[PDB]
Amino acid sequence: CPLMVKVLDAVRGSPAINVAVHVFRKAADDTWEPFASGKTSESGELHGLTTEEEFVEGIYKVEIDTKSYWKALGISPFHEHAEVVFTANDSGPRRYTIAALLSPYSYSTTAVVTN
Amino acid sequence: CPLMVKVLDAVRGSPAINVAVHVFRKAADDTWEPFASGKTSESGELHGLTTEEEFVEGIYKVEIDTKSYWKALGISPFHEHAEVVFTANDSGPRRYTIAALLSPYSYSTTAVVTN
Amino acid sequence: CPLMVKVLDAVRGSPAINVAVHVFRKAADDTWEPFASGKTSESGELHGLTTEEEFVEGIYKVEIDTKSYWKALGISPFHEHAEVVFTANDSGPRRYTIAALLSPYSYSTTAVVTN
Amino acid sequence: CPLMVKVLDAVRGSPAINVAVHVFRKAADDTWEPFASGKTSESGELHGLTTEEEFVEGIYKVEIDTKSYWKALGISPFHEHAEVVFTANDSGPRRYTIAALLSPYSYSTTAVVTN
C-alpha cells in the first residue's frame, strides 16, 4: 500500500465517510489518465488504491469529491473538489499518505511520507 | 498598531464578526496578567489592542473566544477557545498579525510578523 | 476587483511574495481555458486579475505555483501546485478572496465570499 | 483509550516524533492540574494517556511542546506551544483524537470524536 488517503470533517469532528476519491496519472501527452479510485471507509480512509509494482515514478493527481460529500449532508459548499497534485519519487522505501481536512469553505491537505 | 487579530469562519466563508479576544502577558511571578481585549469588526479584524510603547517584550497569550462565537450561531463546538502563545519583541519591536480560521471542531492559526 | 488571491508562508510567517497564479475557466467544450494570471506582491496579494464585466458565471480554477515558490527558496516541496476549483457568480456577482497558507508538505486554502 | 494525540510535521511531511504533550484537568478553583503526559511515538502518536474510569467529564487542556520540537530540528518557531482546550462530555460512547499539524509559524488542530 504505497498510497493511502485519509479525510476528516472539521464541521462534525469525524472521519469523512463515503467520500469519492479519484486518482490520475499524468500521461506523456499531458492529459490525466485514470489510475485508481474508491470511497473512503467508516474510518475516513481509503486503502488498497495501488501496489508498489504499479505505483511508478510520475506526477499523480488525487481528486477528492468534497462537493458531493457536503451536499449529501445538506450543507452548502464552496469548492468543486479538492485536488492534490504531486510527483512520486523513488528516493528509497516510501509510503505516501495524503490527508485532507474538510470545511465547507476551506480545506487543508498534508502529505505524510514515510519508511 | 503592533498587534492585530483577524478571524475567518470556514463554514460560511466570511469574516468571523463580533468575536471576543482577550490578551494576557506573563508577569514576573508567572501569572497571566490581563493585557488588552476587544472584539472583531465587520471585517473580522481587531485593531487598536495596544501601542508601540505598551507592547513591551514578553510572553503573550491571545485567547480567542471561539465557543461563544459558535454558540451564538446554534452550533455546539468542540473547543473552549483558541489560545495563541508566543514570545514578542525579543529582538526589538515587530508588528504581529495573529490570524485564526475557525470550524466547529477545528481551528488553524498563523502569525505574520513584519518589521 | 471581484477576484483576489492572498498567499502566506507558514515557515517564515510572512506574505509569500512573487508567487505565480494562473486562473482558468471551464469552456463550453469542457476544456480549461486560460482566463487571467499574475503574481503576488510584497504583501502576498494579487489584485487586478479581472473585472466585474469579464468575470462571468463559470467554473474557475486558480492554480497557485507553490513548487516554484519553495524551489526558489532551496526547499524541495511535496505538491506541484495548489489548485482551487469553484463555481462563481451563480447567484449573481460576488467578490471572492482565495487565501492559501503554504508549508513545504502541506497547504490550506479558504475562500471569503462577500456581496 | 478514550484520549489519543496525533501530531504531524508540515515542513518535513512526517509524523512529529518525540514531541512532549501535557494534559491538564481544570480543578474546582480554576487552576490546571496535571492529568497525563507523554512523548509522541515514531508514528507521531501518543496512546495510553488515560482510561475510561479516569477520564470523567470536565474541561481539559492538551499542551503540545511545539517550541522544543522545532528547536531540536534547528528551526526557528513562533509559538511557545499549542494548547487545545475542550470540554469532555458523556453523550454516549466516545473516543477523542486530538490531531495537530505543525508549521513553524502556524498550526492547526482538529478533534475527531467517535463511536
Numbering used by the authors:
A (entry chain B), B (entry chain A), C (entry chain A), D (entry chain B): 10 to 124
Question: Which statements did the authors publish about this structure?
Answer:
Transthyretin (TTR) is a homotetrameric serum and cerebrospinal fluid protein that transports thyroxine (T4) and retinol by binding to retinol binding protein. In the quaternary structure, the TTR monomers are arranged into dimer-of-dimers configuration and form a β-sheet rich, homotetrameric structure. X-ray studies of TTR show two funnel-shaped binding sites for T4, each defined by a dimer-dimer interface.
As is evident from the Figure 4C, there are some structural rearrangements at the opening of the ligand binding site. The comparison of cavity volume in holo forms of TTR indicated compact AC site as compared to the BD, whereas the cavity volumes of two sites in apo form showed no considerable difference. Comparative analysis of unliganded TTR and TTR-ligand complexes reveal that in the unliganded structures the conserved water molecule forms hydrogen bond with the side-chains of two important residues, Ser-117 and Thr-119 of the thyroxine binding pocket. The analysis of hormone binding pocket dimensions in the crystal structure of wtTTR apo and holo forms show that the binding site dimensions in the holo forms of wtTTR are slightly dissimilar to those found in apo wtTTR.
